[PDB]
Design a protein around this motif. Structure first.
Motif, PDB file in Angstrom:
ATOM      1  N   UNK A 270      26.466 109.803 -71.171  1.00 38.56           N
ATOM      2  CA  UNK A 270      27.117 108.554 -71.470  1.00 38.56           C
ATOM      3  C   UNK A 270      27.986 108.547 -72.702  1.00 38.56           C
ATOM      4  N   UNK A 271      28.000 109.630 -73.488  1.00 34.34           N
ATOM      5  CA  UNK A 271      28.693 109.633 -74.767  1.00 34.34           C
ATOM      6  C   UNK A 271      30.155 110.019 -74.634  1.00 34.34           C
ATOM      7  N   UNK A 272      30.520 110.695 -73.547  1.00 38.37           N
ATOM      8  CA  UNK A 272      31.837 111.288 -73.428  1.00 38.37           C
ATOM      9  C   UNK A 272      32.468 110.816 -72.138  1.00 38.37           C
ATOM     10  N   UNK A 273      33.783 110.999 -72.061  1.00 31.93           N
ATOM     11  CA  UNK A 273      34.471 110.892 -70.775  1.00 31.93           C
ATOM     12  C   UNK A 273      35.186 112.203 -70.491  1.00 31.93           C
ATOM     13  N   UNK A 274      35.159 112.617 -69.230  1.00 31.44           N
ATOM     14  CA  UNK A 274      35.891 113.795 -68.786  1.00 31.44           C
ATOM     15  C   UNK A 274      37.118 113.324 -68.012  1.00 31.44           C
ATOM     16  N   UNK A 275      38.308 113.793 -68.403  1.00 31.18           N
ATOM     17  CA  UNK A 275      39.558 113.324 -67.825  1.00 31.18           C
ATOM     18  C   UNK A 275      40.395 114.499 -67.349  1.00 31.18           C
ATOM     19  N   UNK A 276      40.990 114.362 -66.171  1.00 35.41           N
ATOM     20  CA  UNK A 276      41.913 115.360 -65.641  1.00 35.41           C
ATOM     21  C   UNK A 276      43.324 114.820 -65.797  1.00 35.41           C
ATOM     22  N   UNK A 277      44.242 115.647 -66.290  1.00 36.32           N
ATOM     23  CA  UNK A 277      45.654 115.270 -66.341  1.00 36.32           C
ATOM     24  C   UNK A 277      46.481 116.270 -65.533  1.00 36.32           C
ATOM     25  N   UNK A 278      47.633 115.809 -65.043  1.00 31.47           N
ATOM     26  CA  UNK A 278      48.459 116.614 -64.128  1.00 31.47           C
ATOM     27  C   UNK A 278      49.389 117.570 -64.878  1.00 31.47           C
ATOM     28  N   UNK A 279      48.847 118.146 -65.938  1.00 29.22           N
ATOM     29  CA  UNK A 279      49.399 119.273 -66.662  1.00 29.22           C
ATOM     30  C   UNK A 279      48.366 120.399 -66.721  1.00 29.22           C
ATOM     31  N   UNK A 280      47.583 120.564 -65.655  1.00 25.93           N
ATOM     32  CA  UNK A 280      46.650 121.695 -65.540  1.00 25.93           C
ATOM     33  C   UNK A 280      45.565 121.674 -66.624  1.00 25.93           C
ATOM     34  N   UNK A 281      45.073 120.487 -66.977  1.00 28.99           N
ATOM     35  CA  UNK A 281      44.137 120.365 -68.096  1.00 28.99           C
ATOM     36  C   UNK A 281      43.027 119.364 -67.809  1.00 28.99           C
ATOM     37  N   UNK A 282      41.794 119.740 -68.162  1.00 30.61           N
ATOM     38  CA  UNK A 282      40.666 118.821 -68.243  1.00 30.61           C
ATOM     39  C   UNK A 282      40.307 118.644 -69.707  1.00 30.61           C
ATOM     40  N   UNK A 283      39.976 117.416 -70.102  1.00 31.16           N
ATOM     41  CA  UNK A 283      39.628 117.124 -71.489  1.00 31.16           C
ATOM     42  C   UNK A 283      38.348 116.310 -71.543  1.00 31.16           C
ATOM     43  N   UNK A 284      37.473 116.645 -72.494  1.00 30.55           N
ATOM     44  CA  UNK A 284      36.231 115.927 -72.725  1.00 30.55           C
ATOM     45  C   UNK A 284      36.383 115.182 -74.043  1.00 30.55           C
ATOM     46  N   UNK A 285      36.338 113.855 -73.961  1.00 32.79           N
ATOM     47  CA  UNK A 285      36.585 112.952 -75.081  1.00 32.79           C
ATOM     48  C   UNK A 285      35.308 112.305 -75.569  1.00 32.79           C
ATOM     49  N   UNK A 286      35.177 112.193 -76.887  1.00 34.01           N
ATOM     50  CA  UNK A 286      34.308 111.167 -77.448  1.00 34.01           C
ATOM     51  C   UNK A 286      35.102 109.876 -77.482  1.00 34.01           C
ATOM     52  N   UNK A 287      34.803 108.919 -76.586  1.00 36.73           N
ATOM     53  CA  UNK A 287      35.707 107.774 -76.461  1.00 36.73           C
ATOM     54  C   UNK A 287      35.512 106.745 -77.562  1.00 36.73           C
ATOM     55  N   UNK A 288      34.334 106.721 -78.193  1.00 37.52           N
ATOM     56  CA  UNK A 288      34.090 105.799 -79.299  1.00 37.52           C
ATOM     57  C   UNK A 288      34.847 106.230 -80.545  1.00 37.52           C
ATOM     58  N   UNK A 289      34.851 107.534 -80.831  1.00 35.52           N
ATOM     59  CA  UNK A 289      35.580 108.088 -81.956  1.00 35.52           C
ATOM     60  C   UNK A 289      37.027 108.412 -81.610  1.00 35.52           C
ATOM     61  N   UNK A 290      37.385 108.390 -80.333  1.00 35.94           N
ATOM     62  CA  UNK A 290      38.744 108.727 -79.963  1.00 35.94           C
ATOM     63  C   UNK A 290      39.124 110.170 -80.224  1.00 35.94           C
ATOM     64  N   UNK A 291      38.200 111.103 -80.023  1.00 39.14           N
ATOM     65  CA  UNK A 291      38.426 112.503 -80.346  1.00 39.14           C
ATOM     66  C   UNK A 291      38.278 113.343 -79.089  1.00 39.14           C
ATOM     67  N   UNK A 292      39.237 114.221 -78.845  1.00 35.29           N
ATOM     68  CA  UNK A 292      39.089 115.203 -77.786  1.00 35.29           C
ATOM     69  C   UNK A 292      38.251 116.361 -78.307  1.00 35.29           C
ATOM     70  N   UNK A 293      37.089 116.585 -77.700  1.00 37.95           N
ATOM     71  CA  UNK A 293      36.134 117.576 -78.172  1.00 37.95           C
ATOM     72  C   UNK A 293      36.257 118.897 -77.454  1.00 37.95           C
ATOM     73  N   UNK A 294      36.651 118.879 -76.178  1.00 37.22           N
ATOM     74  CA  UNK A 294      36.779 120.123 -75.420  1.00 37.22           C
ATOM     75  C   UNK A 294      37.966 120.011 -74.481  1.00 37.22           C
ATOM     76  N   UNK A 295      38.628 121.142 -74.213  1.00 34.73           N
ATOM     77  CA  UNK A 295      39.578 121.217 -73.107  1.00 34.73           C
ATOM     78  C   UNK A 295      39.212 122.399 -72.213  1.00 34.73           C
ATOM     79  N   UNK A 296      39.468 122.249 -70.911  1.00 34.59           N
ATOM     80  CA  UNK A 296      39.165 123.267 -69.914  1.00 34.59           C
ATOM     81  C   UNK A 296      40.466 123.543 -69.192  1.00 34.59           C
TER      82      UNK A 296
END
Ligand SMILES: CNC(=O)c1cc(C2(C#N)CCC2)cc(NS(=O)(=O)c2cc(Br)cc(Cl)c2O)c1O
Length: 304
Positions: free
Chosen positions: A196-222
Motif C-alpha cells: 500500500x505504500x507505493x504505486x507502480x506505473x507503466x509509461x509508453x517510453x519503455x519504462x516501469x516506475x515505482x513511486x512513493x506517492x506520499x513523498x512524491x519520489x520515484x524509488x525504482x525504475x524497471x
C-alpha cells in the motif's frame, strides 16, 4: 537468485485481441477479457476452459474480481460496466454513466464500490449493490488507462495518456497528489503496491516506475522491455521471490528483481505482443496473454 518459470499450459478460445487476464483472489480461476465482447473463465491450475460470460455489445478492455472471488466487473467499449455473478453467469447490474468507452475497472477491498476509468477523461465511483454512480471525478485531460483502490479503500490511483498519475480521496473526491517525473510520456497503467505504500506505473517510453506517492519520489525504475504503444499491465509477484512482471511488445514476458531492478527472466513462446500478465495469489504461477496474431494465454510455473 532468480525464478525458473516454465511453460505448463497454453489456452485458446478468444477470437479477437485479449485485453486483460486476472486470477481470482481465491486462486481457483483465471478470467480473461477480449475485443470479441466476451469474458472467459479458465481453471487456474490446469488451464481448462470453464465458460464464457456474454452480454457486452462491444469489446471489453478490462475485467476485475471482487475480494471474495464471487463477482466480476468488466469495462467495455459499449460505454458500460457490468457486474457479474461468476458462479451463475448472471449480469447483476449494468453501470451506465460514462459518455465514452470504459477502459479500466476495479472493486474496492470491501467490494461494495467499483471504480472505473474512461476515454471520457473521467473516473467514476459506483455502488455495487444498487449499480448507481455515486461520484464522477473530472480526473484527466485524456483517456484514463487504469484505476485502483489502495489497501483500505480510502484512496484511488488513476493514470492517463495525459502523462499523469493522480491520487484521489475516495470520500471527498479531492485530487490529493499528481505524480510526474520531469517528462510526461503517456501513462498506460498504475496500481498500488501490495503493502500500500507505493504505486507502480507503466509509461509508453519503455519504462516501469515505482513511486512513493506520499513523498512524491520515484524509488525504482524497471527497464529493458518494449512498451511504446499498448496498455500492458505490470504485476507484483508476491508468492516466492519479490519480482516485477510485465508483458512487452517484443513478444516476451519480463521478470525483474524488485530491489535490484535487474532482469531475472524472460519468458519466450508467444508470437505477438504480450498484452497482459497476472500473478497467482498463492502459487508461483504467471498467466500471460498475447495480441491477435497469437491469440493464446499461457500459464507458467516456477519453483521459487
Ligand atoms: C526485502 N524487501 C522488501 O520486503 C520490500 C522492498 C520494497 C522496495 C525495495 N527495494 C522499497 C521500494 C521497493 C518494497 C516492498 N513492498 S511492496 O513493493 O509492496 C512488495 C513488492 C513485491 Br514484488 C512483493 C511484496 Cl510481498 C511486496 O510487499 C517490500 O516488501
Amino acid at each position: 537468485v532468480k525464478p525458473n518459470y516454465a511453460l505448463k499450459f497454453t489456452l485458446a478460445g478468444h477470437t479477437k485481441a485479449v485485453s486483460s487476464v486476472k486470477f481470482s483472489p481465491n486462486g481457483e480461476w483465471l478470467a480473461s477479457s477480449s475485443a470479441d465482447k466476451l469474458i472467459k473463465i479458465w481453471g487456474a491450475y490446469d488451464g481448462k476452459f470453464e465458460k464464457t460470460i456474454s452480454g457486452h455489445k462491444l469489446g471489453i478492455s478490462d475485467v476485475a474480481w471482487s475480494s471474495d472471488s464471487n463477482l466480476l466487473v468488466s469495462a467495455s467499449d459499449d460505454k458500460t460496466l457490468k457486474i457479474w455473478d461468476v458462479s451463475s453467469g448472471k449480469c447483476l447490474k449494468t453501470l451506465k454513466g460514462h459518455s465514452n468507452y470504459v477502459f479500466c475497472c476495479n472493486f474496492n477491498p470491501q467490494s461494495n464500490l467499483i471504480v472505473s476509468g474512461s476515454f471520457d477523461e473521467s473516473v467514476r465511483i459506483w455502488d455495487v449493490k444498487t449499480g448507481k454512480c455515486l461520484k464522477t471525478l473530472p480526473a484527466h485531460s485524456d483517456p484514463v488507462s487504469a484505476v485502483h483502490f489502495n489497501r483500505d479503500g480510502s484512496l484511488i490511483v488513476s493514470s492517463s495518456y495525459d502523462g499523469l498519475c493522480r491520487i484521489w480521496d475516495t470520500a471527498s473526491g479531492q485530487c490529493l497528489k499528481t505524480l510526474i517525473d520531469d517528462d510526461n510520456p503517456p501513462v498506460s497503467f498504475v496500481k498500488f503496491s501490495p503493502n500500500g505504500k507505493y504505486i507502480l506505473a507503466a509509461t509508453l517510453d519503455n519504462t516501469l516506475k515505482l513511486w512513493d506517492y506520499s513523498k512524491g519520489k520515484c524509488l525504482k525504475t524497471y527497464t529493458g522491455h518494449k512498451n511504446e504503444k499498448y496498455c500492458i499491465f505490470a504485476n507484483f509477484s508476491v508468492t516466492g521471490g519479490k519480482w516485477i512482471v510485465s508483458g512487452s511488445e517484443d513478444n516476451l514476458v519480463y521478470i525483474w528483481n524488485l530491489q535490484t531492478k535487474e532482469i531475472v527472466q524472460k519468458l519466450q513462446g508467444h508470437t505477438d505482443v504480450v498484452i497482459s500478465t497476472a500473478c497467482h495469489p498463492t502459487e508461483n504461477i504467471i498467466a500471460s496473454a498475447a495480441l491477435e496474431n497469437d491469440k493464446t494465454i499461457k500459464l507458467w510455473k516456477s519453483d521459487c
